[PDB]
């Protein structure tokens, strides 16, 4: 997460770090807990992941260094990538992981609800200039949306759809990037956390007037429940 700020234990209990183990164990992407067995995340995160045997989902994580050998995780039984997903910039950048097991939820590993916006937070781990390294402490930033209409105007030769939703600042400086990818745009609406967008793609990161494009989760609900059963 660019230009954001350290989070704290218990806070974003729907955030998860999705790890690959092969060839070495490391953070791949963010996810959002949505149910017993269901992480929702981005499809472009499985670029050449050919099998779920190498993923691990840790929840109730803040520092990445917390994760040791003996830490509990959820394996991934199935990867369900949108049938129409072929490329991020052209939408459908959504995906679900069916787990081996289910979350015995607590305070720091609860699910988050879907929609049907004003207080919106982008969370995630995300990269640095320098040895393609992953930020250790889960970061957050508050950001507001931009109308697809404005977004569209700021991407003249790619096509923003109704199944996308954009969100930086106009001065720039705050964003979700690679590593954050797949991670939630969570918004508190009538005092309740709904999962509104998924960190998908962008041009630069946190650049002035170049806001992130997030899979507009609202438009895939029915898609999601053809599977959360």
């Amino acid at each position, epitope marked *: 997460i660019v230009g954001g700020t350290a989070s704290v234990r218990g806070e974003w209990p729907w955030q998860v770090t999705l790890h690959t183990t092969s060839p*070495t164990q490391r*953070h791949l992407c963010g996810g959002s807990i949505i149910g017993n067995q269901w992480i929702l995340t981005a499809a472009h995160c499985f670029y050449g992941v050919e099998s779920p045997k190498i993923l691990r989902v840790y929840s109730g994580i803040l520092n990445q260094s917390e994760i040791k050998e003996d830490t509990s995780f959820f394996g991934v039984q199935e990867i369900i990538i949108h049938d129409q997903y072929k490329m991020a910039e052209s939408g459908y950048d959504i995906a679900l992981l069916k787990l081996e097991t289910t979350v015995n939820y607590t305070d720091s590993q609860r699910p988050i609800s879907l929609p049907s916006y004003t207080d919106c937070w982008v969370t995630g781990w995300g990269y640095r200039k*320098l*040895r393609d*390294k*992953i930020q250790n402490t889960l970061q957050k930033a508050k950001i507001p949306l931009v109308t697809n209409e404005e977004c569209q105007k700021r991407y003249r030769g790619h096509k923003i759809t109704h199944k996308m939703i954009c969100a930086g600042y106009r001065e720039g400086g705050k964003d979700a990037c690679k590593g954050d990818s797949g991670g939630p745009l969570s918004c508190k609406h009538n005092e309740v956390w709904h999962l509104v967008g998924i960190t998908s793609w962008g041009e630069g990161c946190a650049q002035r007037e170049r806001p992130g494009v997030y899979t507009n989760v609202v438009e895939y609900v029915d898609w999601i429940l053809e599977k959360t059963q």
Partner: antibody
């Protein structure tokens, strides 16, 4: 378990060459960036160069750039430091280091070191 | 090109005392700052990363703080085994640079 052994140290005339080596063991070498840090006699820690997991992206201290070449091969588990146009200011214990786990860059594993003495 | 000013150069203290070492970066390196212990005869070893994160195996009397430009490394209760030279290091950008080191010795 995790280990870096260096070798090729010793004595070399000024103007000379020397290839240092480091045999990494007990980790998947391929995936980690690596640096040589040295330490001249009584003492000071000085970073010399580094190279990314894959061998592209190499980077050097001003005092050795154009003289030293870092490289690796991952199919033998070995990091190298080709040191040319040596000079007394290069006399030092040379350490092979790993540049940290996925969430930070620093030197999280060091070998025992190997001594290079540039003197005629 | 970033320069690291460590201080003091050497110090002496009795077992049990607070020991505090400082490290100032010539510019904002946020929290990209590591601390190392080198015991006599031995290779340095990494104790603290990212300003305050304490690595595996490191005992709880070590800790660090700072971000931006002023850093501090502290030993809550100095032990005889903590005899060593300690070194800060910015990992903000290349080249990587270290402090001059603080020699830490035991009064007794």
């Amino acid at each position: 378990e995790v280990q870096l052994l260096e070798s090729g140290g010793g004595l070399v005339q000024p103007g000379g060459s020397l290839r240092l080596s480091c045999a990494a063991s007990g980790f998947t070498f391929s995936q980690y960036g690596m640096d040589w840090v040295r330490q001249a006699p009584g003492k000071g820690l000085e970073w010399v160069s580094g190279i990314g997991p894959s061998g592209g992206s190499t980077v050097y201290a001003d005092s050795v750039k154009g003289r030293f070449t870092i490289s690796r091969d991952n199919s033998k588990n070995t990091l190298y430091l080709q040191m040319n146009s040596l000079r007394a200011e290069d006399t030092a214990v040379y350490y092979c280091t790993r540049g940290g786990p996925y969430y930070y860059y620093g030197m999280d594993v060091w070998g025992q070191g190997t001594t290079v003495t540039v003197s005629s | 090109d970033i320069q690291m000013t460590q201080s003091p150069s050497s110090l002496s203290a009795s077992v049990g005392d607070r020991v505090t070492i400082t490290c100032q970066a010539s510019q904002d390196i946020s929290n990209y700052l590591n601390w190392y212990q080198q015991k006599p005869g031995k290779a340095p070893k990494l104790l603290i990363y990212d300003a305050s994160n304490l690595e595996t195996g490191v005992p709880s009397r070590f800790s660090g703080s700072g971000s931006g430009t002023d850093f501090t490394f502290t030993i809550s209760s100095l032990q005889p085994e903590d005899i060593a030279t300690y070194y800060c290091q910015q990992a903000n950008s290349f080249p990587v640079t270290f402090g001059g080191g603080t020699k830490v010795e035991i009064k007794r």
